[PDB]
Amino acid sequence: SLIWGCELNEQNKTFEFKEHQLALRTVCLGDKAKDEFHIVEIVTKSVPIATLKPSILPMATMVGIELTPPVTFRLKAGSGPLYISGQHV
Amino acid sequence: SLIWGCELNEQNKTFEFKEHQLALRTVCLGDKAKDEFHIVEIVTQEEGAEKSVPIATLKPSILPMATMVGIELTPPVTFRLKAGSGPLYISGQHVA
Amino acid sequence: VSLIWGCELNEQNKTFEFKEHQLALRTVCLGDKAKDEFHIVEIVTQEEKSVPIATLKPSILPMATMVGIELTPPVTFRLKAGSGPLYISGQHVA
Amino acid sequence: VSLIWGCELNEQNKTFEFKEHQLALRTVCLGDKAKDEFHIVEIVTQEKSVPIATLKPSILPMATMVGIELTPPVTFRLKAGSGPLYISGQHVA
Amino acid sequence: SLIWGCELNEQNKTFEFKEHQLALRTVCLGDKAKDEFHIVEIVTEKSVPIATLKPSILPMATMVGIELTPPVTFRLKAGSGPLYISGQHV
């Protein structure tokens, strides 16, 4: 077990996590993130897993989401920064 | 275990997922979704009568997403967009 | 053996009595036509003891995810406040 | 041996004590007549108070507690807010 | 187990949790906290944001499945606080 995390933003919309297993914990926006909808999806086919917005819902708790690498996280919408936290087992 | 997901919207209000188990994880709205209440329900047949069970109510400006916990379903299961224009995304893990 | 379950509570039918079995709750959410006011659902048992488990409101918090709540029938769900409809979803396992 | 449990905290009754036994918390939610202000519930041990929830009628009327299992005795204190604030849980033994 | 908790604020932005495992339960703001975004991150250097709160938007958050092996430092990346973190020290 090793705490893990990544940041997605306008300039770096994608992050890839390349046995091993990643359990997600939270997704949250930076305080300087544009006040608009942010959507993070997992790409393998893309699957939206979270929709956040600073003035509406600044974060979300992920539960029971365990992924087998490799997995790519893409910022479908929003300027970010958007942080994803998890445990790399 | 295989990550799964579907989109429901005004055009396609229904998605029929057809030993297997589907564990739901999240429900979230698209950024272009109409700012109104969206309701997703699971539909099954009960006593020869249709029975739908609402599992989530979302709205862009109020609650753009929800985390589903402990919801494991045995196919076949139909997800219906009871209300809202969508798009509404449902994510889950399809384990077989 | 599991079976998806659910019920609606509203002004007209403020109560629903769910009559080895266990009911695991999953979510509580409001209908889109529900009055924009606070809705409170409570579980009622004889000890009469009622235990509030959720407070919702259309314009504030339209739904809630229930976790680790497993009940042994019989159990009654009562709409303490609000016009509804308020839906409760769960899994009835046996 | 599980038994649904619950208590109400308010301005006049800021404290409630839960006096092997285990209490698993499920939800915290405000009454519809609760003052539109921040409500904070904390667990107190001897003291040692630990805030576990911050609610407000017009902002966040309730919260789902997860994985919180307590060994009696435990005291719940309404650090702030008029209430009523309800705490639900499963008392097993 | 042993219930645990700490407060982070403008004047005490950091708290270090010095086999043992800390399971987090909730993060919530004090009623006197400045109405602005508060961000708490875990630091190991690698800092990992785990929560973004704001009094008038989202006053608290439930942490799930987050179990940590000491030592672990919690840092208030942003916000005046107070911000409370609750957990079970097993």
Side-chain angles (χ1 to χ4, degrees), chain A residues 1-10 12-17 20-87, chain B residues 1-10 12-17 20-44 46 48-96, chain C residues 1-19 21 23-45 48-94, chain D residues 1 3-11 13-18 21-45 47 49-93, chain E residues 1-10 12-17 20 22-45 47-89:
Chain A
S1 214
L2 200 66
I3 95 174
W4 167 98
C6 77
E7 166 178 341
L8 296 180
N9 55 47
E10 217 157 47
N12 298 283
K13 302 189 168 59
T14 291
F15 186 91
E16 177 186 63
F17 166 63
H20 303 64
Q21 180 194 59
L22 216 195
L24 300 185
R25 301 311 187 202
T26 61
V27 178
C28 57
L29 307 178
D31 60 346
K32 296 304 163 194
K34 208 152 170 292
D35 195 5
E36 56 181 5
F37 289 108
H38 286 63
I39 296 170
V40 50
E41 61 187 4
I42 289 174
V43 197
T44 44
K45 190 181 186 197
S46 55
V47 173
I49 60 170
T51 297
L52 303 172
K53 184 171 174 181
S55 67
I56 310 299
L57 208 239
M59 75 174 283
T61 299
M62 301 298 104
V63 181
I65 289 177
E66 271 138 44
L67 311 152
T68 299
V71 242
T72 305
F73 297 104
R74 178 165 58 197
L75 189 56
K76 195 193 195 66
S79 77
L82 178 148
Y83 309 108
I84 306 181
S85 70
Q87 295 177 197
Chain B
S1 203
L2 200 68
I3 94 175
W4 167 97
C6 76
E7 166 178 340
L8 297 179
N9 54 46
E10 207 156 51
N12 301 289
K13 299 190 170 59
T14 292
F15 187 88
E16 302 188 65
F17 166 66
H20 298 84
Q21 270 209 169
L22 211 195
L24 300 184
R25 300 311 186 203
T26 61
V27 178
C28 57
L29 306 178
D31 61 345
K32 297 303 164 194
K34 208 152 170 292
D35 194 4
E36 54 180 8
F37 289 107
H38 286 65
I39 295 169
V40 50
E41 61 187 5
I42 290 175
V43 196
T44 46
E46 238 239 25
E50 186 189 86
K51 193 191 179 193
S52 48
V53 173
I55 60 171
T57 296
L58 303 171
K59 184 171 176 179
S61 65
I62 311 300
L63 208 240
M65 75 172 286
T67 300
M68 301 299 101
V69 182
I71 290 177
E72 270 139 43
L73 311 152
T74 300
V77 241
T78 306
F79 298 103
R80 177 166 59 198
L81 190 55
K82 194 193 195 66
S85 77
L88 177 148
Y89 309 109
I90 306 180
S91 70
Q93 295 178 196
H94 176 17
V95 331
Chain C
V1 191
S2 210
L3 203 67
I4 94 175
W5 167 97
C7 74
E8 167 178 342
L9 298 178
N10 53 46
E11 220 156 49
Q12 315 169 309
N13 298 294
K14 299 190 170 58
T15 292
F16 187 88
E17 185 181 349
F18 167 63
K19 295 192 176 195
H21 300 78
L23 212 195
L25 300 185
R26 301 310 185 203
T27 60
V28 179
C29 58
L30 307 178
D32 60 346
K33 298 303 161 193
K35 209 150 169 290
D36 193 4
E37 54 180 8
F38 289 107
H39 286 64
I40 295 169
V41 49
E42 61 187 3
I43 289 174
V44 196
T45 46
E48 192 196 76
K49 185 175 187 176
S50 53
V51 173
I53 60 171
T55 296
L56 302 172
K57 185 172 175 181
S59 64
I60 311 299
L61 208 240
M63 75 174 283
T65 301
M66 302 298 100
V67 181
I69 290 178
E70 270 137 45
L71 311 152
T72 299
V75 240
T76 305
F77 297 102
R78 176 166 61 197
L79 190 55
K80 195 192 194 67
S83 78
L86 177 148
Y87 309 108
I88 305 180
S89 70
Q91 296 177 196
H92 170 47
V93 320
Chain D
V1 189
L3 202 67
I4 95 176
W5 166 98
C7 74
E8 166 177 342
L9 298 178
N10 55 46
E11 210 155 51
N13 299 289
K14 301 190 169 60
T15 291
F16 186 89
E17 170 143 71
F18 168 61
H21 293 88
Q22 223 194 196
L23 212 196
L25 300 185
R26 300 312 184 202
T27 61
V28 179
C29 57
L30 307 177
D32 62 344
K33 296 303 161 193
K35 209 152 169 291
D36 196 2
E37 56 182 6
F38 289 108
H39 286 65
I40 295 170
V41 50
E42 60 188 3
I43 289 175
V44 195
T45 43
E47 249 186 52
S49 55
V50 173
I52 60 172
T54 294
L55 302 172
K56 183 171 176 181
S58 66
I59 311 299
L60 207 239
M62 75 174 281
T64 300
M65 302 297 103
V66 182
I68 290 178
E69 270 136 44
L70 311 153
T71 299
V74 240
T75 305
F76 297 103
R77 178 165 58 197
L78 189 55
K79 195 193 194 66
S82 78
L85 177 148
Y86 309 108
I87 305 181
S88 71
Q90 296 177 196
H91 175 41
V92 329
Chain E
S1 176
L2 204 67
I3 93 172
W4 167 98
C6 74
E7 166 179 342
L8 297 179
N9 54 47
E10 213 154 50
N12 298 289
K13 302 188 169 61
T14 290
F15 186 89
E16 171 171 63
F17 170 62
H20 317 24
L22 212 195
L24 300 185
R25 300 312 185 201
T26 61
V27 179
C28 57
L29 306 178
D31 61 345
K32 296 304 161 193
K34 209 151 169 293
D35 195 4
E36 55 181 7
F37 290 108
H38 286 64
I39 295 170
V40 50
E41 60 188 3
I42 289 175
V43 196
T44 44
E45 174 200 297
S47 56
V48 173
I50 59 171
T52 295
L53 303 172
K54 184 172 175 181
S56 66
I57 311 299
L58 208 239
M60 75 173 283
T62 300
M63 302 298 103
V64 181
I66 290 179
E67 271 138 41
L68 312 151
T69 299
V72 241
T73 304
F74 297 103
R75 178 165 58 197
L76 189 55
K77 195 193 195 65
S80 76
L83 177 148
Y84 309 108
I85 306 181
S86 71
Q88 294 177 196
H89 171 24

